């Protein structure tokens, strides 16, 4: 029993974190085999932040202009290239701690663990979600760029996010590990702003299913809904539309609990109408949307209470 | 505004 | 910017987790130097648990009755003894991954990171507080006993909790690493329940300071209060009394944000008496009490390990 | 109830 914002154990990622310095600029890099991945804006100077030409900035660098430090060891850089908005520094040592890994680009609504780092060293680990507006609500300070987000289902690390920058409202933007930004953002300090964000409906339904698995039913009601009518109501509260794909994804939780998906949608409609009237659900007084259906099955018992 | 979250080298 | 429930990096602890099996009972152990620590209830059958005599049950066990697995390696058990409610299995190899560590017993209100494990393999990490009623609101299923809680400081892992049991309300109880229970709980199958809890006042104040650091200021007001006036409200709302020591601990945050502790206390008093009037703080509609003053400093200043 | 959270091997 219980239900927590549960991250993956961070050791397999800790073993890949290094510091990368170019000029007077430093951030974190990810050392996998003989490549160090890091945001390309490490090659900017304070003159290059609104309209850098990264091809031009990079052609001016040699291998030995990149200082890569793995704990007390300086790694030797023997090649460098850029792929979209990440640099790839080839080094002459394969990381002995490289885990089994893959790169994955995720969709909005997906969750992942973040290992926040400064100067190549870990500060802490927390759970995040990719918001519908392609930002993440992280906790990041200057020097955190190159920190990564990941999952570790089944002993393979899937790296899905690398941190680049903070937007004016204090949320965060970055790329996959191929250097392609999530959302319409660019690695320029020119004015950019998160779009209007919405609530991740399929994840709120997942978490209501978690509440039932753990023993609580107070929020259910006797009604059902069509998918159409549900979406017409939920979008009046800035919820994302629920698709038939989402309905399909919730099938296993619906089966474990005996509550049809569209009946849980009816419950959610009433919760949005009523609030919780002084109650809590899994320890919260708001409807939580950063747990996916897969996260709920990962964390909860297979036997409902 | 938009802030790259590198840091200045110590 | 941002503020998340943040755990310590768990890598140092991951390298210490092993599987311990005795008979048909399996749980986790903590391998440090040449000793594996685990809950002494691993030696019990279900019938044993109704009225166990642990010394008597342990006398019947030989070293080869304890199967200890570190990844794919069986450890050779060369001795066995018990300290309070933990077993100490001496093995013939010192763990080469033993970190700098100490065993520390914490007090209610202090937080720690939990490394949830099954079958000796780390599965998740999350942040916990020791509640005033000495339970923890964990997330644990069968097989999680022997999972540990810890803090880090610089180089040193301070182990403070080893998981034993779940109570009827779904909260959790366990020991320090010397086998002493937190709370009035016993490792016997008999009726037991969590007592009524309270809210950790100094932690709520710390989180209000975190909110101010993040730009959430709507709850500040012109008023101040006194310790005695504030503690009458704390009693009425089942909050822990605030002490002078607590005020002193918040001093950093109070001189930093620009808001004195008893000024922040007048904000908390107003929130208890009036609620939040539809607003939220740091994304919560509840007053959060599982961040200590040091947790806030460590996250907001990017302390690393 | 009260559960000692070992698992069956």
Residue numbers in the entry:
A (entry chain B), C (entry chain A): 1 to 305
B (entry chain D): 119 to 128
D (entry chain C): 206 to 214
Give sentences from the paper.
The SARS-CoV-2 translates its genome into polyproteins that must be cleaved to release individual proteins essential for replication of the virus. Given that Mpro processes the majority of these sites, any intervention that stops this process, such as an inhibitor, would block viral growth. The crystal structures of inactive SARS-CoV-2 Mpro, with the catalytic Cys145 mutated to Ala, with 9 substrate and 6 product complexes were determined to sub-2.5 Å resolution. As in previous apo and inhibitor-bound crystal structures, Mpro crystallized as a homodimer.
